[PDB]
Amino acid sequence: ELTPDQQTLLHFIMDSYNKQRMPQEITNKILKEEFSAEENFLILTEMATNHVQVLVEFTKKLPGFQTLDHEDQIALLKGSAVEAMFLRSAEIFNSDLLEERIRNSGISDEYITPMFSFYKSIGELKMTQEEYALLTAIVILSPDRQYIKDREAVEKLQEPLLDVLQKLCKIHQPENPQHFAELLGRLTELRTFNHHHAEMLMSWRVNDHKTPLLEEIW
Amino acid sequence: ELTPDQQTLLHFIMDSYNKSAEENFLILTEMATNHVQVLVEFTKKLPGFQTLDHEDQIALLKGSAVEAMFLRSAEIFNKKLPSGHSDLLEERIRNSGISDEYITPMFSFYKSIGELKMTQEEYALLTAIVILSPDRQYIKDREAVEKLQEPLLDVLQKLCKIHQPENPQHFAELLGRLTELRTFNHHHAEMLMSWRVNDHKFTPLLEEIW
Ligand SMILES: CN(C)c1cc(Cl)c(C(=O)N(Cc2ccccc2)c2ccc(O)c(C(C)(C)C)c2)c(Cl)c1
Ligand SMILES: CN(C)c1cc(Cl)c(C(=O)N(Cc2ccccc2)c2ccc(O)c(C(C)(C)C)c2)c(Cl)c1
Numbered sequence: 001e002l003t004p005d006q007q008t009l010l011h012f013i014m015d016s017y018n019k020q021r022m023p024q025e026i027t028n029k030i031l032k033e034e035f036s037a038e039e040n041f042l043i044l045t046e047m048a049t050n051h052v053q054v055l056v057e058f059t060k061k062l063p064g065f066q067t068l069d070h071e072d073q074i075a076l077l078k079g080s081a082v083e084a085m086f087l088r089s090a091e092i093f094n095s096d097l098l099e100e101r102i103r104n105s106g107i108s109d110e111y112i113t114p115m116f117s118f119y120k121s122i123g124e125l126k127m128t129q130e131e132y133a134l135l136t137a138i139v140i141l142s143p144d145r146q147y148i149k150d151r152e153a154v155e156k157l158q159e160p161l162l163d164v165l166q167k168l169c170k171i172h173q174p175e176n177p178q179h180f181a182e183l184l185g186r187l188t189e190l191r192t193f194n195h196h197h198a199e200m201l202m203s204w205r206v207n208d209h210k211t212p213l214l215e216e217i218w
Numbered sequence: 219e220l221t222p223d224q225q226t227l228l229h230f231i232m233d234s235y236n237k238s239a240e241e242n243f244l245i246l247t248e249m250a251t252n253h254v255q256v257l258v259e260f261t262k263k264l265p266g267f268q269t270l271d272h273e274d275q276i277a278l279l280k281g282s283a284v285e286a287m288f289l290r291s292a293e294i295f296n297k298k299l300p301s302g303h304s305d306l307l308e309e310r311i312r313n314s315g316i317s318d319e320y321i322t323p324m325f326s327f328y329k330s331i332g333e334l335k336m337t338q339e340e341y342a343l344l345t346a347i348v349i350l351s352p353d354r355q356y357i358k359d360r361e362a363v364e365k366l367q368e369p370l371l372d373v374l375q376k377l378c379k380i381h382q383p384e385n386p387q388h389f390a391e392l393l394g395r396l397t398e399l400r401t402f403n404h405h406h407a408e409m410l411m412s413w414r415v416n417d418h419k420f421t422p423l424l425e426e427i428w
Contacts, residue, residue, distance in 0.1 A: 034409060037315060041243065042413050053428050060424075074422045081423055106240055106315045203419040204244050210412035212276045213283055214262075218255050 001167045009063055010130070010164055016061040017133035020054045022047070029208065030097050040101035045206040051088050052202065055081065059140055064157040072148050079145025082198040083190040087136055089115065094123045111197045118193075122186060128172065131183065134165040139187050219380050224373050227265065228339065231370070234263040235342035242314040247415040253290050254411065257283065261349055266366040274357050281354030284407040285399045286345050291324065293341045296332045320406050327402075331395050334388065337381070343374040344392060348399075 002010065029043050059065060059077050068076070092098070102112060127135075138161050143154040169180040176182075209216055220228065237259065261267060261279050270278070298304050311321060350367035352360040378389040418426055 036409070038243070039409060041240070041315075042247075042415075052423070056423055056426065056428075074424045077424045078422060106243070200238070200241060202423070203417055205416045205418050207414045208412055209414055212280065213254070213258050213411075214276050214279045216258065218258075 001171060002164065006160075006164050006167070009160060010134075012061075012063065013133050013137055013161075014130065016058055017129075017136070020058070022050055025208070026050060030095075030101065035101065035104070037104055037106050041105040041107070042206055042208070044098075044102055044105055044107075045201070045204065046208055047092075048085065048089075048201070049204070049206050051085055052081070052205075055084055055088065058136070059084075062137055062141060062157070063160075065141070068153055068157070069150060072150055072154070075147035076141070076145050076154060079147070080140045080142055081202060082195045083139050083187065083193075084136055085198060085202075086115070086118070086190050086193065087132070087139060087187075090119045090122045091132055093119045094127075107197070111194065114193055118186075118189065121189075125179075125182060125186070127183075128168075130168055131165065134161055134168070135183055135187065137161050138165065139190070219376055220373065224369075224376065227369060228343075228373055228377075230265070231342050231346060232339060234260055235338070235345070239313055239315045242310040243316070244415055244417065246310055246314050246316075247410065247413060248417055249294075250287065250291075250410065251413070251415050253287060253294075254283070254414075257286050257290065257345070260345065264346055264350065264366070265369075266362075267350075270362060270366075271359060274359055274363065277354055277356040278349060278351070278363065281356065282349040282351055283411055284404045285348045285396070287407060287411070288324070288327070288399045288402065289341065289345055289348060292328050292331050293336070293338075295324075295328045296336070320403075323402050327395070327398060330398070334391055334395070339377060340374070340392065343370055343377070344396065346370045347374065348396060 026043075026047055029046075033039055033043060056077065059080075065073065065076075099116075138158060141154055141158040141161065143151040143158060148154060165183065166180045169176075169183065173179040237256070258279065267275060267278075295307060299307065308325075311324075347367060347370050350363055350370065352363035352367060357363055374392070375389050378392070379386075382388040421427075
């Protein structure tokens with residue numbers, strides 16, 4: 001069912017979605033480091049710091065994103081970043097040590113409980129990598145973010161991706177005509193989450209340089 | 219009373235020296251992040267430091283960093299910034315999730331060294347003297363380090379006689395504060411020393427440089 005052009009759109013979304021790569025140093029810390037509230041927080045925030053970078057990269061490569069007005073590009077990424085990070089974080093769980101660090105990191109259950117139920121609801125959907133990648137592009141190119149001067153130009157970028165995802169939900173899950181709707185339902189659900197804690201964190205950058213002090217590069 | 223050569227040393231050292239709970243924790247670790255960088259640049263400028271063998275340079279800075287950081291935190295804390303009378307930094311510390319285990323001795327040390335009415339020159343010389351401690355683990359040439367440390371102790375002991383001649387205890391009190399820092403538990407600070415925290419809140423996310 002995909003067209004050649006639909007195949008190519010999908011191809012370039014997958015290459016840029018892959019190429020995401022979490023340094024082994026970060027993933028090794030999860031098992032090996034001390035478990036204490038401060039170390040746990042610094043490890044989760046270092047991972048999230050890697051995710052923001054990957055997210056911003058992925059956004060800049062999205063098909064047509066660079067064609068948009070520069071002030072609207074800023075506003076689109078500002079509006080979408082929290083929900084896109086939430087979606088990313090789910091992929092990381094779907095790790096038993098990672099959860100125990102999250103549950104003793106000083107972060108309030110106010111924010112941990114909704115996220116963990118969200119992860120379960122995502123695992124139930126049996127999402128392919130192709131489906132994560134498309135849904136991430138879709139949440140990012142949302143034409144209704146605040147502060148967008150030209151909503152129709154963002155609609156033009158989003159709509160081809162919505163078409164491709166819908167065709168993929170038909171092919172891969174013919175017995176479930178409600179698969180596509182249920183994917184979009186997860187994005188609807190993220191918009192209802194409390195974004196305030198994530199917005200407070202979104203500008204912070206945490207990196208472990210545990211290289212001799214004397215040889216460190218600033 | 220300082221010799222011309224001692225004045226040359228002092229002015230050089232001074233020129234080199236003059237270069238929610240989660241949210242409070244990030245702010246404090248960002249400040250400390252800046253302090254490590256300053257401390258490392260100051261160390262590289264110490265007279266003679268670059269002439270030491272490379273492994274002894276690494277050993278000195280590694281073995282002395284915690285103490286030098288604690289001394290820098292005392293200098294900042296007692297300045298009560300930005301006003302000279304603000305309790306903001308103390309309030310952030312008390313609500314940052316850091317345990318009383320680590321806060322209590324730091325506060326006790328800030329009060330103790332605060333009563334000595336430290337000058338910047340005293341801080342700069344005491345930092346240099348901490349870093350050039352010849353007795354650290356893993357130093358091969360202890361005698362060369364001791365030779366670098368000695369003229370700084372000499373300048374500092376003179377500065378104490380010049381500026382506090384009625385308080386002959388003053389140099390001894392400075393050395394006793396260094397023994398306190400050496401004896402404090404370093405485990406928490408060693409855990410934090412390699413972490414680097416910065417708030418990139420001045421650009422939109424799209425324009426941030428990675
Ligand atoms: C840029 N920084 C330092 C951020 C830190 C966090 Cl915790 C978050 C954040 O709120 N979360 C959501 C979350 C998930 C699980 C429990 C509490 C909060 C976030 C976003 C991406 C992530 O990879 C993670 C981790 C915990 C899975 C690393 C967390 C974000 Cl958005 C940014
Ligand atoms: C490189 N990083 C992120 C460090 C963080 C801290 Cl809290 C510390 C640290 O242990 N202290 C000591 C301390 C002071 C007050 C309460 C608890 C612990 C440290 C070192 C330099 C500092 O500037 C600070 C602050 C609290 C004054 C920012 C703290 C160190 Cl050494 C390094």
